[model samples]
Target: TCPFYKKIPGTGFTVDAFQYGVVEGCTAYFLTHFHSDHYAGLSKHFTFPVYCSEITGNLLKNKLHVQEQYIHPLPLDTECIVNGVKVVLLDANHCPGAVMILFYLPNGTVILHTGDFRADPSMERSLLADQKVHMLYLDTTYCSPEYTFPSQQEVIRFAINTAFEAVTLNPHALVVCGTYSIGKEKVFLAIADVLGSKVGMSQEKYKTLQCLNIPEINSLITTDMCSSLVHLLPMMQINFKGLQSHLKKCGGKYNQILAFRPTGWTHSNKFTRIADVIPQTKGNISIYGIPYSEHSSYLEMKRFVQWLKPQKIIPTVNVGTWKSRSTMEKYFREWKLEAGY
Candidate 1:
């Protein structure tokens, strides 16, 4: 972010690892989320004193098997000193252990670098910020007006309604679905939250939950404890083609129970030899069609830009048409946003 090491040479490496959070003197570096695209190559250069959220920090170590020295840990809304710079962790709300970084610079720059985020304000209860931002690096993911949809609560209601409609007629079979390591996992709990019952995950899945640190919406139980009710497990291996017949060959039974995900690439398929054709024909799988997403919609982004009231805006995650760094500021006047207006 300076003149000396500012421009990476044409060969790439224009900026030093120090630019991540280091001083103009090249004191230190920082990394954001645990996602490969963001943090993978960074460790190769900025191996010393990199700050990350608690979840991401653990992930790089255990999941990716990366090693670092003086890796500063930033918990939600907590601030830590990394190489004399204040690095804070903000919620990305995309995947479990995902995070956005807010850089408190030595030259009085409050840089909010969002790794990724969503519009569900309900998910962020512990993080509260009254302090003004000098500059904000926004997550301008769905900046185009065309990227519009109904609210998350509405989507949840629709999914629950659809499930209820299906289950009422065919209550004998078990139904399962795919969710993210985080948000969609909450979908089952959301339905149970409204229905006054509990959703269950297999003991193995429950272990995954506690290990992943998915937030508790309510008191949903482990699948072993849920032996009284129908059991639901996440479909980790997506090879649905052979699942049914293979389970059947093992004498493991399946009924009208539907297991699916709204992933764009995964669409309609038949498991007729194991179950019935009606459920498959009914379009049982879904991709990311549910309410969960990494960033907010265009309308929601407009609302956030209005609320933050920054002296100047910055784009951090850089998605959609906001791919360029200048994109975050362009939407302000084009959309006519005013603080508390």
Candidate 2:
């Protein structure tokens, strides 16, 4: 979870800090994305002006029911002035509505706030090639050296191949994907496309996906349970107990269940190759914890930091304790030294 509030130095703006209510000197509230942890205290009662990407603004309006008067959606890659500071929203590559905020203070300081991102090579050439970042607010979710994982493309390919194989073995096996409200959509979409099957989900989840206006996904969503062999459910429902109940609810239409729990936490340094990652099975259920994460891996973050070479770095996640914060700082120091900064 994020801290109560993180105030940017020399500015009255706060990013992803709504739980502590209105800060005394806060001038504006900025959200990185629509994740619950980021938008915890935001509601219709919040009167502060909120700024974010257009997609995120729409999500806040539809999902959280926040008032439209306070929402400001900025165009990506365009410089805009907010409270006398130059600001720009760039793609974070984390989730659908997520973005990395760039701030240029009047004092000539430049700050890049990566709300939560997967550091793909495209970002280096597209967004931050020549920019000199003075301060960086990094995600640092997988800051440790031992937390390396495969690239998103590789993971998605693996998941699709595995799902295809399972379906070929047993055509009646129900393929279920555990997902969050807005992330890991690419994985399931790829799987559904390869299998040529519709994706079944709860009505509420279907409605939420409609807000994204993705025509391809819209065509695949079905509220009818029996209409599609592939289904999408919340992450909590992918466990053995939950899957057993879900299997029962299906009325024996499917003999076996194939579920995927895609996340970064399932990966470890112990696994040298992506092929080494396997599935767990019990009875008629098979649950695969794939390394399909939206956040960057340790090596990816290190590369991002070395490329950006900011003067100061501030971590956004895993900073709840002094010990953890100091450990992250040591990693930053080592990266800085390695970058010759």
Candidate 3:
């Protein structure tokens, strides 16, 4: 039961719904980023033209093998006309190629589709500030008041410091940071920088990173498993049993393991400080679930909705059922009321 809003109402466009297969009346396809959830249905055999950021386009080409003719790379903050509708791509702050799609329709309607984003202060100065958005397709991943957490920078700094201290105590400990294929890169990258070590990842992930075109990450990545003490693996591999097996697979090259599972779900309302969330340790393996997230916080979402004041709001995530959808609408109502709109 994956809750997804595929179509942009009143437009002939389908967003991130390649699995649905040629949605009726959809003249164009939009991909916000290369994340698996967003690009779930996309495949090499798809025929529709997909609009996305250049980095996202590059990822689609390399990873999914989506044909070159259909990959339309739209530059950031620039306006492009697609199927007689004005569209603009703004940085989403979620991942390397993620973007918030802005649409200007012929009927004087302005819509913002935040595929998945971290609401930041910089958005106040973007083109969104000038336009009156009629509708908002919000990324309601952490849409509840109870879902509040520290900013990404704060969490990353804390992660780096925490990892640094742990490794300082155990110089021979192999630091393994859990991550998605695209997001949560800052956490591991900063840790590697402070630890002064290269990052070991699978060759497939290294190829994906190369698509990002970030010069710093290029130097930090190594396919050689034995070359770096810091390793990046999928989020599922951060568990005790997984870490135990990973260490065993290394054949005693490292004395212990320090794994960081960076995600927003780790944050709880009961914890006052990010440091309050403790690590789980067993034998020689330690796991820390850090509150490092790419999605907008509860407060951030509130501020964004209040600022934008869109006439209609749509929850993209966690809306599989009417109960969840209505639950999110309550928060939206509160936010709109707070904005005096």
Candidate 4:
């Protein structure tokens, strides 16, 4: 027989999760979010039984292309008893299907895991927080100082400035953002915020931002992104061929065009080097090379963690490997009984 709390065998091992004999005899598994980092383990191991929010289940169905039997979908506000554990799925409000979760034990203990969260409130409300949060797991992706992801509005300003310059120089300029579909929505949101009080954001953009703002964390602009999105959003679209045709028909007096993106040269050089599209400047296309990310800054995390006041502040992505783990750990210990996993 195993002890009550002996590393919570098969709960997770890190170096490739759930590698030990059918997840170490555990009864329930939780899927916090479907990001590659969080969901890869599902494909690797833990195929017996998994619980997730309804939205997450949908995304897993579409994105990961998984079968129905393996997934046990739970709607928010409904609690299910799995292997005697009361599992509740909360709204993550990330993308379409992300979630936060509550793992309620038979002993009345509660566990809280905030998957990649921004500043969303509706998402938080979904979590039935009647009981005290015992152990809280957080995504500390923006814990370090080197990363400076800004707020959504800040990036909007940058987008308007940059895109406007490009348009003035050449109407034919083709701007592209190298990001995932979900990430693209955020970039678009920042553009809309910059265009705020100007022409008013489009209905499509407003709906999307409103949805992301539900949970509240879907950060945009990073206090850094955006330039000329006011003019640029109206210009760009899903159809490049149509755009090219329109531009050529107009016979726009433009000699050169510019674009924006942060993907490295080795990755995007081949992509943006399109004969039909605008030619990207050598160092001009890559913006990250010049500045840091603007999401939650180093001090932001410190402030956030202090506010949440989780007992064991386990670093989901970078626990022991983090250089600032010691710093955060020390702060938590001396200031408010914080410890790192």
Candidate 5:
């Protein structure tokens, strides 16, 4: 039953309170970010001391409107003590303010929980100073070898360039960027600046970005219907079925609605790390799902595990959802055998 919450044994600390209900013995809590799946059951009723990045704290404090007294903002790369235990927050590189937590236990053991992040060079550099990780709670979102995607940075560039070309080709048409409410803020921000167009979001997305309070981001997001050259719409709304009706009513406000969907999934082909353009058309709308994922792919996760070589591995996702418990056991057995660890 301990699926979403990661608690340190013999300690009162919790990694994330995905379930809002009180954990029987836990006192301190931490939130990696405000992604809906990550903050599933959190609400204003949460009163415990919550450790998180300043940006995450702002979302909790302003967006969710949690009382300020209980929110403690943890600074990145700085060591701090929470209830006499040494702790540090490192950039997760998944989203703005997302972080991986490092905990130094009293008994000379170190625990690392990679709270939904992409493995990158900077994150690896930060871990070099640490001696050894006793236990690692891994984020195995794309733990299967089938998921071989390009780096997020590379994908972001690809998406932006793709959108720029589309905009140039169809100057009068609306360039719609499809995104989830939170995760793809970086892409939108970059696209808006590069394209020199204000990005429009629904009221719901507007409020979420307001809590982030980033000057570059907040200035670009608008709730009003966009007459601008490019518009940012939720990824869920840009699909064939959803866009079907909207296309009819669009009434030639723009020539065509070109959508750029930045996700690990594709519109066509099994793995598209090479082909820059793969368009899917339906009626007056067109879409391209670019390979921009936050989680590390199977090969990335494998290298990470070998680099850390923790004594024990505790996956963050449910054992049933991510290829079952036996598959995990066998998968790591191959890793251990390959590295001869």
Candidate 6:
């Protein structure tokens, strides 16, 4: 019944601090990251003892206004005992404050919850080195072979280059990037550093960025659109309606607006394994849907689970979706009977 976490029979510990399924019955909770989908029902009224990264704990306190005493900050790579259960946190590499949780059960089985992470090669030397994880709760965001995207670094470079090209071609145009509430700070910072210009962002975004302590990401408050070279807009605002409105409003001097939305969904077709920056050009604006994702691709996920060699694979995504069901079955079968079961 749970989309995020469930209880281990005979054990008191629950994996992932989800708002559903295990919230009431679980003894303790561990959060992977502060993504909205993961923390759907979390709020000031939450009563559970939640464990997460230091940054995630801070975000819960400052962003969601969750009680400080209830939130426990778990340092990365350190083992700690909570309610008689041994647990360790590892960097998830998905976003700021994201972590993959490793739980050592009293029954001698090890459970690993890869909290929405892209597989980092460095894990082979550390976390994934010697650990024999028993059960794996996977983040199958891009489990399908059709979902292929370039590395985050390459995608960032494409975004910066595309912005430069747009601005160069259409001088005096506003170069805007569409990003999520939490992730994609790297893209904005790269553009700012490369172009030698400060980005314009909302006050709320600035406050969130401030908590990150990334001093270089301090952006100017966007009041006059003409002042800033690149404006960082919310991912939702990169729609046709929004861009159309902006185009009509800024007709005089700020005549054009080039918006880039970096996401994995851009690569719908199973084209070349190597992704390229492709833009959708229209009347007065161009939207570059760059295939930049924080989640692991199909091949990466397969490699990760195989390396872990978990006895059982439990996908974290909804099984009701046809794509998810097919992808899980195909991958599980490939993992063979022992790993799949």
Overall local distance difference test of candidate 2: 0.85
Count of backbone collisions in candidate 1: 12
Of the pair 4 and 6, which is ahead by TM-score?
6
Write down the worst ten-residue block by lDDT for model 5: 265-274
**TM accuracy, model 6:** 0.88
**What digit string (tens of lDDT, one per residue) describes model 4 on residues 79-115?**
7776656666665535555665666766666766666
Every candidate's lDDT: 0.51, 0.85, 0.85, 0.47, 0.76, 0.74
Of 1 and 3, the candidate ranking higher by lDDT: 3
TM-score of each: 0.65, 0.94, 0.95, 0.60, 0.90, 0.88
Deviation in Å, model 1, residue 89 alpha carbon: 2.6
Model 1, global lDDT: 0.51
**How many residue pairs clash (N, CA or C atoms closer than 3 angstroms) in each of the candidate models, in the order given?**
12, 0, 1, 37, 0, 0
How many angstroms is residue 18 displaced in model 2 relative to the true structure, after the best TM-score fit?
0.8
lDDT of 5 by residue, 1-341 (tens): 44444788657888876574878777788888878877777778877888899989888876777889989998899989999898899888787789999889998889888998887656567854557888888887776667687766787787678778877887766767777756766677777777887777677777777776577664576766644556666677878776665555556677677777777644342544445467799766788777777778888889888777778888876466544666776777788788877
- Show the lowest summed lDDT stretch of 10 residues, model 1: 265-274
Residue 136 local lDDT, model 6: 83
**Ten-residue region with minimum lDDT total, candidate 6:** 215-224
Candidate 6 has an lDDT of 0.74
Least lDDT summed over 10 consecutive residues: which range in candidate 2? 1-10
Q: What would the per-residue lDDT of candidate 6 be over residues 261-329, giving only the tens digit for each residue?
A: 766665453664334445677777888776667888887887777677777778876566887677687
The residue ranges of model 4 lying beyond 4 angstroms of the native Cα positions read 1-21, 41-47, 77-80, 93-96, 119-129, 145-149, 180-184, 188-257, 262-296, 322-324, 337-341
| Tens-place lDDT digits, model 1, residues 37-69 | 455345434445555667666655654545756
TM-score of model number 3: 0.95
Give the root-mean-square deviation of each candidate in angstroms.
Answer: 7.8, 2.0, 1.9, 10.1, 2.5, 3.0
Ranking under TM-score, best-scoring first? 3, 2, 5, 6, 1, 4
The positional error of residue 47 in candidate 2, measured at the CA in angstroms, is 1.6
Summarize candidate 3's per-residue lDDT along 118-196 as a digit string, tens digits.
Answer: 9988898999988799989989988877887787878888888887898899887899988777887888889989998
Runs off by more than 4 Å, candidate 5: 1-5, 18-20, 213-215, 244-252, 266-271, 321-323
